[PDB]
Amino acid sequence: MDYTLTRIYPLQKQEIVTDPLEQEVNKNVFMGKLNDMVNWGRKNSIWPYNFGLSCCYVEMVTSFTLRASPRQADLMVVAGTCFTKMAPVIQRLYDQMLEPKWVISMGACANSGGMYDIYSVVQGVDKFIPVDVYIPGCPPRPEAYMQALMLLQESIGKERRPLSWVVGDQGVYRANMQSERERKRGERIAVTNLRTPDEI
Amino acid sequence: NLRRIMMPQTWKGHPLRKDYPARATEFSPFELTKAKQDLEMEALTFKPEEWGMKRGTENEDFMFLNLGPNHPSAHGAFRIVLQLDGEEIVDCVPDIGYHHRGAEKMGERQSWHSYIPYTDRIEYLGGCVNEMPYVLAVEKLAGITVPDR
Amino acid sequence: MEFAFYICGLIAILATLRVITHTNPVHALLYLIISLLAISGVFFSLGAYFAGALEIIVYAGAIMVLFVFVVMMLNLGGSEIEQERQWLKPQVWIGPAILSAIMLVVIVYAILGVNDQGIDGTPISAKAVGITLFGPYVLAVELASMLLLAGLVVAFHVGREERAGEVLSNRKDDSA
Amino acid sequence: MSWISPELIEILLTILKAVVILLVVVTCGAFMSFGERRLLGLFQNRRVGWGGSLQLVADMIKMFFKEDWIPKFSDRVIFTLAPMIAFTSLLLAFAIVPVSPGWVVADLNIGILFFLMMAGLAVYAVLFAGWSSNNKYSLLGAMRASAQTLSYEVFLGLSLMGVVAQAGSFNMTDIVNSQAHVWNVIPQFFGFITFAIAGVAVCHRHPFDQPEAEQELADGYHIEYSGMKFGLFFVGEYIGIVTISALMVTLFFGGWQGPLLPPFIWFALKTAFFMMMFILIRASLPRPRYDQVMSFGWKICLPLTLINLLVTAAVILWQA
Amino acid sequence: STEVIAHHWAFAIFLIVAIGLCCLMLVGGWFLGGRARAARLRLSAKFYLVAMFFVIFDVEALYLFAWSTSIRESGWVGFVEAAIFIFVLLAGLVYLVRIGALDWTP
Amino acid sequence: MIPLQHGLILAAILFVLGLTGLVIRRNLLFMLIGLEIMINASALAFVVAGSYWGQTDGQVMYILAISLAAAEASIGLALLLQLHRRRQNLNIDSVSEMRG
Ligand code: SF4
Predict the structure, then answer these.
(1) Is there an interface between A and F (3+ Cβ pairs < 8 A)?
(2) CB-based contact F8:C109 (threshold 8 Å)
(3) I need a labelling partner for D97 at 20 to 30 A (CA). Which of A75, A170, C78, F63 fits?
(4) Going from the N-terminus, what domains does chain C have, and what CATH number goes with each?
(5) Which residues from B are below 8 Å from E41, CB to CB?
(6) Residue with the nearest Cα to atom 2 of ligand 1?
(7) What's the CATH code, domain A3-190?
(8) Using CB atoms within 10 A of its CB, is residue F73 exposed (0-12), middle (13-18) or buried (19+)?
(9) Which residues face the membrane's Cytoplasmic side (chain F)?
(10) Are D172 and D112 in contact (CB under 8 A)?
């Protein structure tokens, strides 16, 4: 598994590296156990902050069926169009969160601007805010967010973040995971026949 | 008070003009930075007159009621500038334009058929109720009388 | 007992000094609560179990709460007075301090000349105090109710607001 | 074992039992937090570990390794002290709870007065949190919650004065030994109801939670808190519920006095019933208006507690 | 007796461990984990009045606490005295409620 | 055993400190805070004396003292509120119109 080191957004240190733990110089069975324990607690305790924008927030509340403060949130779900007047607000809320933090882009608009390539819309939240999981759709089905959360859990269980801010390497090593598209290419292509669009 | 209602007050140019480009311009971090600062300095640089409001008996507190994720009810996220005398509202100005996606400008960049997807996104909770007025109007332009079914 | 008396007695004097010389009002109240908890330990060390509890239940759990309420209500702190820090200016505290020092010296002299068989520390219970309150000191308890009633009536008369609303604007002469 | 003395081991076993009680209480409060969340979901017809039991452990790890943050313009001392008071207030009050014959951290003469001392200091957590946060809206919410607490802390002690009257003592063991025949739930029924209402209010539990609901200019005294400091308030509340529950058992349900099961088992059994009774209450109870809770505490509970004590005194002196 | 000495030490340890546990969790949160490198208005006196009323009633309850632990020893005379005290307290409470000083909503 | 004299000196130190506070501070709040130190110190002395004589009278006097402190602080802070509401200033030096 290769990792991307974000040592100390559009432009920042992104050096592809090897598992820092596997490196013998910094290889300790105890340290590895500690890393796994922290990753386990974080992936099984992702408190969310749903920034409600446009129509995607409505699908999100259906899935909900709260860390009202960005301070208590570990994940910011950008669900809606990134309007010009809203972009400063989104950046401020994300900048009022503490490490570790994650961002899931839900919807074509948050992903790339979607059908709204217009003068009053930022073409993607990834133009100003780092994103971890992208959910295609418009609006993405409530169940799609659940899949995205599970994908984030997997990515979080493989991260190598500093165990303490006073000792060790303060670098966030994120694993270069395999694309879901290539992972499930086989089953998708094998599909042959489908139900005719004639019945309910 | 004739001030911009849909675009930032610092916006240059009138979007719905024909000579105005419709597609989005290159993202500029600098503008976001400045926009973010202006937002942080809004309370310090607040003038009531700019919002059409006037200071009266004085000591009246001008306030900004943010109605976004703090109070989210699928109504969207906007703010109302509230002029209060204790808890009584002396005057309020709803600040809107935070959800403007240039849907009317898109009508001039999409065919009569390729615009249908956009109609449903004017009032998301209405779905087909939003495409009824559009299809019926285009049918008047086409001279089409739809069958009873 | 001896350790408790001297350690709590010292915690109290040090905290009290921090209170009178502090600039932040809430910090001053915090050190005042610390001194009240220390005096409660002194009470317990001397066998005054009832007084001990009351020192934390009424003085540091009611009278002080009221003080914090007022500081938080009027957003006190950072006022020109607390910015000028005049009390710290030597020409402002030297005179008062000398008067207080001379008063302490004269008082201590009188105390040092008193009979002192020592305080044993035998615990005096709240039951014993209650028998005294509703026995020899009955008129005190009945008249104490009238005293607290007077405090309630006066505090309401001068403390009540004429302007309705949880949040009010500071206007000259509280004009409505 | 050379230094070991028959007396030393007594002064060592006692310290060990006290530490055991402290640990078990903190564990119980934390577990209840999870046990509740799940039960509430079952009521709403809706995992990390064994039935989600490890979710509690997961949260603790996340909160410990979460960036600790004190607002740049916040009084660090007051901001840091608030969570501490919330966690170490009713926890200390458990020192008076006799869990079983031979198991009590402190058999104090002041007895119940110690709980009142700690309950009185708990209010500062809410006040300090609001003032230190530096959020104008947090201050208003803290003040609303603090005023609500004082409206219930006023009759908290008076609600237990009938029990003290019958026992003739503030000592908890004496109070338990005085329920040998009849538990005080029957004679001091109004006391039990009023104490329960005040106890949940002191712990800021449903329906005395969210006192900032009506005011749009109020947010909450936990808005600026994050990580462990935020968790200390949450855990403190559940530790307080455990302490209150264990006080109700000791004051109105005979404590560890039961017909057949071991004494400690009774204590636990009853305490668990109260801990889950609050859970049933949380689900089956509509939150009343801030105005209603303020009025109910001063116009109904306070008068009733004052009347119960007078009537209890008359019956006691009459029977004598 | 060693029992009272043992209970004294146990109480002290419980208090020290309890406050120590809170500090440990707090200092752990501060150390464990990484970190990003990085007047005109007032509150109504209705908040003060509630606190002031609490103070007055709480100090009044002190006397009733002392009576509670000694009702039998004080006898019926003590009951009559306490009854007058409780009546004055209730009379003042009635006054506060009737003057509307105890209604949060205007 | 604690020497009665040691207890009385503790109270005297807290009394003189409270008085110094009441004279050096111009803020009405710090003046009211200073008075609380003075009355608490006087109540402490009564408890020390009652403990030396083994009498409940010391604690009975303490209860009367804390009752006055509660009532006096209540009225005191009410006047502070009125002064703030009308003059938005807690400098007691400004409350000096009547003189001579
Ligand atoms: S992606 Fe589609 S559904 Fe989601 S907010 Fe944008 S337009 Fe609405």
Answers:
(1) no
(2) no
(3) F63
(4) 1-160 (1.20.120.1200)
(5) 61
(6) A138
(7) 3.40.50.12280
(8) buried
(9) 25-27, 81-100
(10) yes
